[model samples]
Target chain A: TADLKSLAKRIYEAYLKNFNMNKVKARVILSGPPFVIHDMETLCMAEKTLVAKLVANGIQNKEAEVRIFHCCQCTSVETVTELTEFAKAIPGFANLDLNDQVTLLKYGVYEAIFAMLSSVMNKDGMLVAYGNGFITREFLKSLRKPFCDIMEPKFDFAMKFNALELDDSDISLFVAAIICCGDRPGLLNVGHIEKMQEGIVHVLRLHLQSNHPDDIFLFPKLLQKMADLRQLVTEHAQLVQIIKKTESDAALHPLLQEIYRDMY
Target chain B: TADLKSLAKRIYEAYLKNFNMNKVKARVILSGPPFVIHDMETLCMAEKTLVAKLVANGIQNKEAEVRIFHCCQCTSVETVTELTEFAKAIPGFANLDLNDQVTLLKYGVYEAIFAMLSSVMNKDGMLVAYGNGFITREFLKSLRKPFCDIMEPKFDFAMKFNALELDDSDISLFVAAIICCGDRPGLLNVGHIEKMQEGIVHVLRLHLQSNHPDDIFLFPKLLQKMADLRQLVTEHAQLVQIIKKTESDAALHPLLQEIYRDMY
Candidate 1:
């Protein structure tokens, strides 16, 4: 137990050192009950640690900007009204309850990162655009060791972290990892990126053929990036297949189990 | 028979003299069964004479723009389809069936003229934006009478013109007119305008009292106009009373009836 604690601390410290603190612009904190935490705590902790380390290294909080805190119970209508009231009093603060927070930590993190990237790429606009890229880089660097450990056969330990109290720097770091190496040769070897890519391709093809009223224009550009990454995954033979093969008579692939394993 | 034919010829000559052919882009001709004409041969002779006169005045067949020759059977779908197809083939022409055409013309010459004016006013935008102005103008002009005639004893006749052709232009005219003059004081006559103002006020009060999704912005504008018009009408008590009394409560006002009646 003592060794495990020391190792966790060391890993956290290394994460802080990998991503530069000067670039972070926004922080997002996600937290909730055990059930919610179980589903999202790992990703949230990784993201939070990234941001906390950046702030610790001397980045100005205001320059970082837009802190979003998610607590599981706060997403209810009554809580939303309270949150809205809180927003009115406190500028640049938003709350997403447990389910949404977990969703963000799980699936929505990539989309959030892409949104930040789009903002960054928009020229002659507000300074908030570049913030996503800066933060995402920090988050990715922080997740390297923990992600690698998850894939190691001999590695065994329960990971724990507070979802709340995470800042913009943390979210940025997580987003960076998701954008850069969430699927490939680096960290977080969960095969989510490939699965996401396949899902997007299937949905897009179905949409084109079904004459559904859904607007194709509404598709996020990040989904296209995911699809492109699928080819890269295919080129590499060592990586686990993100999508499971299904038997002719089977209704679902085993990949679905792995994909939604963390989801509540 | 000869006396009726001579009367018809005189009427045609007077009509031609009153209207400037150079300014007329389109003309609608109305005819009926042989029984209605009383003498089919005389009517044919009269038509031939009119055609000769038109030629003498250098009004070429193509220059006439539109010639709608119809009998009682024009109400049939086949007749409407034929007319629609023909109208569609004409360059820069809008063809509508007798039903639509009659609807526009029923509103009085002023209404019909207003409809045309609305169409010309904002020809660039979608036709629905023109509002009641186009409908009113189109209806009035269809009667070939002055605006004041629509407010007189032949108001029922005016309503007939309102029944004429409606296209995008007509809808645009209606929307514009409703936006502008819906609740405003009568720009034409004080006494008549007062009655109009009262009707608008009643509607306004109902809307205000109701909780429906009211466009709060335009409603206030309409209400203010209604109040102003009512005040103006009250100031001219005698004329207001006279016009109000002369105006029939059944469908249209006396002036509109007069204009439409003259068309027939």
Candidate 2:
């Protein structure tokens, strides 16, 4: 028991240091059995300290908000709304309001969060992983371009250690510039962008990922064509600055953003 | 809509005027859909004002708690835990620490709150119904006793104001009260208490309620005997008081307090 407490503490400390607010705006939420922390007041105190440190480093409380919830029977529209509101209060926190039951059954909220992250995050922003769950693993797999690194946990006899796994999906989602490109980019090639956008669309349409019939009908073909056009514009270096200026405007809506260059 | 808002305001004003803090202390929480408040902001302001009034009236924040969680995919264990912990931080909040999952499966937290109210109050507390989802007609049936009265939006227009109903299993569990002694003075007869104790044993055997299965086997026979002894003590008022004073000597667990008897 003491060992477990120590392990939890070490893990938490490592989380704080690695995901330091200065380096990356990271938030950690705890959810599980109530009795797990019955005697672990110190853990709560440590979490508070970590939050304070993040805030001191200029990460807003809303940005670094950590929540703890239960695994079962907690998922519902009302709870999501509350958490989303909390998340949105934080300045860079991605809006998850669209992921209701209808959306989940259609696009799978887990997959959608990753897709949105891919669309939004600047080159420097990083998405880290901790803990294990069915949805979390699936989201990690959907990353297409080599974009980020992953730190995974491995068990060793009596102890656990963090292992840096140079996995493809992690790289594709976090490191790959192709993953970062929106409607326009200087390096963008029309054919490549079309292929990438198709890949993203395929991931969204995967029945195993999101089996909702509504999703089958909702995929915007016109938007995909627009993305292809934006890629064409981005191939010329002379259009780089102009494309960059319109990128933010286009990216506001998943469908509209892709059509920006086509409309122009 | 304007008429409904006016009616709500009038009703709230009446509650403010008629119900003192002591009366509010004996209140049962209603879970349901959104009430017909003037507007979202108005509803929030009204709720805050009501909570402030309760706090002013000796009802510790911990004693009177409210949870309105929407159904959504993100309502996972972690989020529920966070919300539960947040609720528990308030002083006098009795229904804190029960996560959303447990709340869904057993409705144990809500039942426990009902049990606590029955134990503490001279009569059933007042019910203020608001929403449709949380408080169903069957739920109301279970609270008919021990609750003084139900106050809510009109339920006459079945077409307009439909009752939220629970499944059969939920309804069955809701009716199975651990303690069913009603408003009769000296209503808890020897056989009655004995039967109540037997019901506890029966429940343990069925594993219907959340308790250690081992404790079920270990304590039933002894508890039955204690129930008999407790019944005999109840017949003697002075002896009950003497025994009450020596409760610390009994070495009873906090769980036992739920069934503890004090004769007047």
For residues A157-217, write the lDDT of model 1, one tens digit per residue. 0000111122233323323323223233322323444444343233332322223222221
Candidate 2 off by > 4 Å: A1-88, A91-264, B1-264
TM-score of chain B of 2: 0.21
Residue A171 displacement (Å), model 1: 24
Residue A197 accuracy (lDDT) in model 1: 32
Instruction: Name the DockQ score for candidate 2.
Output: 0.01
What level of docking quality does candidate 1 show?
incorrect
Residues B182-230 of candidate 1: C-alpha lDDT, one tens digit per residue: 2222233334434433443344334333322444454454334334433
Count backbone overlaps in model 1: 100
